Write a protein that binds this ligand. Structure first.
Ligand SMILES: C(=C1/CCCN=C1c1cccnc1)/c1cc[nH]c1
Ligand SMILES: C(=C1/CCCN=C1c1cccnc1)/c1cc[nH]c1
Ligand SMILES: C(=C1/CCCN=C1c1cccnc1)/c1cc[nH]c1
Ligand SMILES: C(=C1/CCCN=C1c1cccnc1)/c1cc[nH]c1
Ligand SMILES: C(=C1/CCCN=C1c1cccnc1)/c1cc[nH]c1
Lengths: 213, 208, 210, 217, 205
């Protein structure tokens, strides 16, 4: 009932900008920042079986908490939209991306009165992954690994939260069999740091395939 | 055309404008009217079900806090959109960034109405089958606020049906049979919020 | 003889930045701002007769006046270069452009002591226009329509030049195409919905494949 | 390590770095050149054009140097923080044979270590003019990439390799059309007969080949 | 003294206090003398159908601004400076058909005597006669570089009075000339001083 009180929203934005530290990780209770990531695939635009590359569009549902941003919403809006330039956002990258992430949507996040932040850009991006079997019944399984680029596991944990039937375009030349998203840890022989990431396994295949029976 | 009046109006708008806060008046959602006027259909890819199009995105809404008495001053001024709140519209089936081809200025009217109408080039995933037939193809584009649900913003059409004869290029390979624009509400199973959108059905065919 | 007086130039630039209102149309008295636009074609890069599209490069000579910027040049520079971010510039758009105007050149304008402003970017841009006849002796005639995007005729008037040429001084000798004629006609656009009229110049590019 | 998640500590370190940092001045200590270490970890080879002698590749550019004025005592505070590169001096590296801008695929953050070490490792997609002859043979092609400071000569910046040899097995995509045989990185000093200054660069030699070189037809 | 950091910071501070990035550094009420020399690095994406060519070149650009000079008897002789802190000539390739792609860090060198050197590596496309590219006589590209907005009374742009070209280009250079040229248009009285660069090349073989 108080959502549409403009002055209240303006004051909330003011409060957020006073407290927000866009360049500092919001670690609370001496624990790493728990970042949840879930990709909702919207389309598969191009796949190349020779080069093992895919071109896809997905909604990157990204959530985390910063309780320093919280406010009492007993008589004020429960949520507001905030430009991400005013907020800290996780420095996520896909390890096997071969193009820049192209953000297709307005760069606004939602901040909830309990301090939860939700940012969900629609991203088009190209990846190097296993496209073998895309023209078969069992299809291909393209794996995409996403994690913090510069923050190791003691600082940020990136965690997962389907056939994406609610999201995936019915007009794609491909169809999604299954999308699994699992916790994964990465370490390199040179160095002690581990990186937490989510491994997204996209199992898909070409629609209306012609087979030899 | 009184320059000092215009400068003062712009000053006033910038003193009052809150570019990041939705202009909810009373305790109601912001009513955003959107109407796409198609100008060109550049490419139609039957292999991939994709279209590349150019359209004017006629967008209007009110912010009465911007209003002024224009009895003896200009009725409207042009304002850079960076000085204004503008709705965070996005097309759900866009597969490229909206490319704005025109100067990023809005008109503000002395009654507080704002008109923003970018020319946009953008690619979409949609049903392209039938494009070379009498019935044509019907490509549906859903547009709405990306982050504001129905209690905060309503996105509504103006003209429900039009052949865009005043807008669409006579030199295109294609012709417009009908552009239908209707209110549409989207909810996802995961969450309670609804998003109020305009569903734009672009029915077009290859000229022959 | 005072053009290269550096302190003079710095002071002129200072004065312009004190006076200039980059977001307000420089209307003088009770009249629209008169804007002249002349396209000088450098090249025609690609033409598609099936889709009726062209890819061109041109110098967009744009002139207007803001008398509030004028100064007494009797013992100072006649002109200076000014970043366009410091100036009001006409919000011109090509109504049949199908790509963003790509500016190839430094974004500087000239301001003359009498208040004339000249901005002439080199632009690469694609258009939807009539390419029919490009392979004939008479060639194709592609019309490019340019006017203010948000200012109607009471606020900005776009006045065509009286020039008639094949742009021999500008156009690449090595283009696959040849320009037969480039002309401009004043035109006014109105839509049935609304009373406002928008002034434009229609630039007619008559060209053919060599 | 126990203090890594102390948020106020991190904010204060960032403030300190921003008070001390001179983003446009080389961090010369004593009167010695800034020692810049560079190591390219190749991830993908996207395109190899045998007609034109061009390659399009993705690599992680591991770049390290020291600015001891940024150091702090981390006995009871975070050992490292992430910092936007706009707040830091970064070496003005360029590849002499690049034919496209470096496209940075990742967030533009560096790590600053409490001893003053800085680590910046962007993933970069870039195109190069190099020798691709032999890519379809057993011995492969060897594409050499020369990287150095664009405007600082050897008295001001030295650009040196880290690891001499590797097949990048931990980094290179197993799904590429190509496979890496060896990546060698050597110091190289370049002077032009016109002028006296020398530029101290790294020559990166990427020896790679197409998989499945024996085809039917 | 070159690697004295505080000295370098102070020089940068001094340059920024005196630099007027938007005002031409005309001295003695004479035009700014800008010297330009292109070093060709590569010839790429040559299209014989469309008569277009990509070139990569280092654009060696020098001029002086004596107000930037300092006494370097006990301090650095030279420093690197972001070009945003300096006036730089507004050079353009008048005839180019693509945006210049600057491939290198946008830093200039400032010498203690006030000399400035800026040398971007640039990739850019041009309209050229490519018809003879596979013949002994070859193809020709003409590139005209000058100030975009400053005429000859304000800026003079003159040519400076195998080490660089890629050994892996498909093409080889037959000749390069870089000549003083003054460009005037029938419509208007101003002349623009430019360097006319003629690049003659052919496919190897
Ligand atoms: C660096 C990694 C691995 C995980 C991805 N990000 C980073 C990173 C770390 C720090 C700064 N920038 C990027 C690395 C892996 C081996 N040696 C260095
Ligand atoms: C999010 C949606 C759906 C409507 C489009 N915008 C949003 C959105 C909402 C909030 C922030 N950014 C985008 C969503 C989440 C689960 N399911 C859909
Ligand atoms: C708007 C037009 C037509 C001329 C082009 N610019 C505008 C415009 C006007 C105002 C703001 N932004 C663009 C329009 C509206 C209905 N019919 C045409
Ligand atoms: C310039 C060189 C050497 C190659 C690398 N960088 C530079 C450089 C030097 C200074 C500023 N910007 C670039 C040069 C000049 C004549 N010959 C070579
Ligand atoms: C203008 C030229 C020719 C040389 C290139 N720059 C300019 C210029 C001059 C002023 C501002 N912006 C560009 C010109 C040529 C014929 N009529 C006008």
């Amino acid at each position: 009932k108080d959502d549409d009180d403009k002055l209240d929203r303006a004051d909330i934005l003011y409060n957020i900008r006073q407290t927000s530290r866009p360049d500092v990780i919001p670690t609370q209770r001496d624990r790493p920042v728990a970042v949840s990531v879930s990709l909702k695939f919207i389309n598969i635009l191009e796949v190349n079986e020779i080069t093992n590359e895919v071109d896809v569009v997905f909604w990157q549902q990204t959530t985390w908490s910063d309780r320093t941003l919280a406010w009492n919403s007993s008589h004020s809006p429960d949520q507001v939209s905030v430009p991400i330039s005013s907020l800290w956002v996780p420095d996520l990258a896909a390890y096997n991306a071969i193009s820049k992430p192209e953000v297709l949507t307005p760069q606004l996040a939602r901040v909830v009165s309990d301090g939860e932040v939700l940012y969900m850009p629609s991203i088009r991006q190209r990846f190097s992954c296993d496209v073998s079997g895309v023209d078969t019944e069992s299809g291909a399984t393209c794996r995409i690994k996403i994690g913090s680029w510069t923050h190791h596991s003691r600082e940020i944990s990136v965690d997962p939260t389907s056939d994406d039937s609610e999201y995936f375009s019915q007009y794609s030349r491909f169809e999604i069999l299954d999308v699994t998203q699992k916790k994964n840890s990465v370490t390199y022989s040179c160095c002690p740091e581990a990186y937490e990431d989510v491994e997204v396994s996209l199992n898909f295949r070409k629609k209306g395939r012609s087979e030899i029976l």
